Amino acid sequence: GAMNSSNYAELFNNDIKLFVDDTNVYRVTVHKTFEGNVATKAINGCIFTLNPKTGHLFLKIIHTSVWAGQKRLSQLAKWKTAEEVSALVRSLPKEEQPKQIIVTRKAMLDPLEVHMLDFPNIAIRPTELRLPFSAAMSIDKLSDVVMKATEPQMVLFNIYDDWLDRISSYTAFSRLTLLLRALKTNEESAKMILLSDPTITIKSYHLWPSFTDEQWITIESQMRDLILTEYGRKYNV
Amino acid sequence: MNTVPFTSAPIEVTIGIDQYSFNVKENQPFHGIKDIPIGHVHVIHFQHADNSSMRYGYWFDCRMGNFYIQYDPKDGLYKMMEERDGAKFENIVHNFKERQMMVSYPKIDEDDTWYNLTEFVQMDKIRKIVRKDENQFSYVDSSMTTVQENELSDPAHSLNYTVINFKSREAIRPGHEMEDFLDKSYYLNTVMLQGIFKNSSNYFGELQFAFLNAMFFGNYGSSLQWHAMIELICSSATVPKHMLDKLDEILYYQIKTLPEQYSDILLNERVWNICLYSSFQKNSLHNTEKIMENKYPELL
Numbered sequence: 001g002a003m004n005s006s007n008y009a010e011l012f013n014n015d016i017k018l019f020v021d022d023t024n025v026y027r028v029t030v031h032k033t034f035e036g037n038v039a040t041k042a043i044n045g046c047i048f049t050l051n052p053k054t055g056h057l058f059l060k061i062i063h064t065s066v067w068a069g070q071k072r073l074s075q076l077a078k079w080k081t082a083e084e085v086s087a088l089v090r091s092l093p094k095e096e097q098p099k100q101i102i103v104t105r106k107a108m109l110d111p112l113e114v115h116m117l118d119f120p121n122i123a124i125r126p127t128e129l130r131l132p133f134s135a136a137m138s139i140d141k142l143s144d145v146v147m148k149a150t151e152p153q154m155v156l157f158n159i160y161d162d163w164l165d166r167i168s169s170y171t172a173f174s175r176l177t178l179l180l181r182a183l184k185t186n187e188e189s190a191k192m193i194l195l196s197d198p199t200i201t202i203k204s205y206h207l208w209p210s211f212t213d214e215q216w217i218t219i220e221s222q223m224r225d226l227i228l229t230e231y232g233r234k235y236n237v
Numbered sequence: 238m239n240t241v242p243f244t245s246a247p248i249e250v251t252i253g254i255d256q257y258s259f260n261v262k263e264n265q266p267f268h269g270i271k272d273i274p275i276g277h278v279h280v281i282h283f284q285h286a287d288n289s290s291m292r293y294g295y296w297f298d299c300r301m302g303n304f305y306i307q308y309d310p311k312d313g314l315y316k317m318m319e320e321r322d323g324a325k326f327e328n329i330v331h332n333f334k335e336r337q338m339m340v341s342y343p344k345i346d347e348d349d350t351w352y353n354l355t356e357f358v359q360m361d362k363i364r365k366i367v368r369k370d371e372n373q374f375s376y377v378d379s380s381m382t383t384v385q386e387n388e389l390s391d392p393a394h395s396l397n398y399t400v401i402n403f404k405s406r407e408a409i410r411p412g413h414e415m416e417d418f419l420d421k422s423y424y425l426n427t428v429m430l431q432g433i434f435k436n437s438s439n440y441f442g443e444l445q446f447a448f449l450n451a452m453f454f455g456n457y458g459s460s461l462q463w464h465a466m467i468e469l470i471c472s473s474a475t476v477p478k479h480m481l482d483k484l485d486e487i488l489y490y491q492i493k494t495l496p497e498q499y500s501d502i503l504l505n506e507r508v509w510n511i512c513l514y515s516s517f518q519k520n521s522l523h524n525t526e527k528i529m530e531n532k533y534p535e536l537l
C-alpha cells in the first residue's frame with residue numbers, strides 16, 4: 001500500500017523501484033489578453049522519474065507541442081505521464097524494470113495502473129511522504145535542458161552526482177530532499193547558499209557543487225537554518 | 238395459474254414469494270402457494286424463525302415443470318423438487334386446494350411491479366449464472382460468492398455473473414487507455430453488448446437478476462454486480478437511446494421496491510452520486526433521479 005515514515009528504509013533495499021512526480025509536466029504562464037481576458041501559455045515541462053537507490057533520474061522532457069489542440073490539459077497531463085512511464089518501463093530490459101512505482105500524487109494512481117495493466121507484477125503505490133520533487137526545476141542544469149528542448153526528449157542524469165562513492169543511498173536521499181525542500185521554500189536563499197563560494201564549482205558532468213564531506217555538513221546546516229527561518233518568517237515565530 | 242404445493246411446514250419460517258411474504262408456524266397446516274402468474278420467473282424464499290442467518294430460495298418458472306417444496310430434516314432446509322408424475326401432482330394440488338390449505342399469490346390487478354422487476358429475466362439465463370443442470374430451478378442464498386469474488390471458494394456453488402472490471406485489459410484498448418477509462422462506451426457496446434451479452438435484453442436480465450438476489454437474500458456479490466452494470470452504462474458517453482430509457486424504467490422500479498430500511502446496505506453512495514450527478518448519463522435517468530431524490534435524499 002502507501003509509503004510513509006514507517007517503511008522508509010524500503011526505498012534503499014535491492015528491489016528496483018522508481019518515484020514518479022508529475023508536478024512539472026503541465027506548466028503555464030497566466031497572462032492578460034488584449035481584450036483584458038486571461039489566457040494561459042504552456043511552457044516545456046518534464047516528468048521526474050527517480051531511482052532513489054542509485055540516483056538514476058529519467059527526465060522525460062514534455063514539449064509544449066504535446067498539448068496542441070488538446071482539451072482538459074491538467075487531466076491529460078496525468079495520462080501523458082502514465083503513457084511515458086509505461087513506455088520507459090517497456091524500453092528497459094526485464095531485469096532493470098521496477099518492481100514498484102511510487103507516485104508522489106494520488107491522482108497518478110489510476111492513470112498509471114491502467115497504462116501498466118500489461119505488468120500485473122509491478123506494484124503501483126502512493127506515498128504519505130511529503131516529497132519536494134516539484135523543486136527539480138530549481139536545479140539549473142535540469143531547468144536548462146527542459147527550456148531549451150525543441151522536441152520530446154529523454155535525458156538521463158544521476159541526481160546524486162558521485163555522492164554514493166562516499167555515503168549511503170539513505171544519506172544521499174536525505175541530502176537530496178533537504179536541498180530540494182530548501183530550494184522549494186526559498187529558492188533565492190538556497191541557491192545563494194549553494195554557490196556563495198566561487199572556489200567550489202559544479203563539474204561539467206554533475207548537478208551540484210563539489211563539496212567536501214566537511215563542506216556538505218556546513219551546507220546541510222545552512223539549509224536547515226533556511227528552512228527553519230522561512231518557517232519563522234511564514235508563521236511569525 | 239400455477240401452484241407450488243408444500244408437503245408440510247415442520248419448522249417455523251417466513252416464506253417469500255416474489256415481493257410478498259408471510260409467516261408459517263411450526264407444524265402449521267400449510268400446503269403451498271396457488272394462483273402463481275404464468276409468464277414470469279418467480280422466486281420462493283425462506284428465512285427460518287430460529288436462525289435468520291441464511292436466507293435462501295429457488296428461482297423457477299412453472300412452465301418448465303411441476304415443482305413442490307418439501308422440508309429435509311437432515312439438511313435442515315425447505316427443498317424445491319420436481320414431480321415427474323403429472324397425475325400424482327394434479328391430484329395432490331386438487332386435494333390441498335379443496336381443503337383450502339394454500340395461500341394465494343396476492344397480485345393486485347393494477348400492479349405491474351413483478352413484471353417490471355423481471356421484464357428481461359429468463360430462466361434459461363438464470364441457469365447459466367447458477368450452475369446445477371440436473372434441476373430446472375435454481376437455488377440461491379445469502380452467502381454464495383460470485384466468480385469474480387472467488388478470483389479476489391467452491392466453484393460448483395458460485396454465482397457466475399459476467400465479470401466486469403474497469404481496470405482490466407478487457408476494458409481498455411492499447412493506445413486508448415485514457416479514452417476507454419474515462420468513456421467506457423467501447424467496453425459497454427463492443428466488448429459486453431456485441432461480444433458477450435449479444436443484446437441489451439440479456440444485459441438487462443442479468444442486471445435485474447443481480448438486484449433481486451441482492452434484495453431478497455442480502456447477497457453482497459449480487460449487489461456489487463448490479464452496481465457495476467449500472468456504472469458501466471452511466472460511464473459510457475455513447476449509449477443507444479432505447480437502452481437509456483429502459484434503464485431509467487428498470488432502476489425506477491428497483492428503487493421503488495427496495496425496503497426503505499435496507500437502503501443503507503443495498504445502495505452504494507459513490508455509484509449513485511456518480512451516476513446521477515457526474516456521469517455522461519447524469520441527465521438521462523429522469524425517473525430514477527426523481528425517485529432517488531425523494532426517497533433517499535440522505536444518500537445523495
Ligand SMILES: COC(=O)C[C@H]1CCS(=O)(=O)C1
Nearest residue numbers: 129130131132170173174177
Ligand atoms: C531518507 O528519508 C529522509 O531523509 C526523509 C524523507 C521524508 C520526506 S523527505 O522528502 O524529506 C524524505
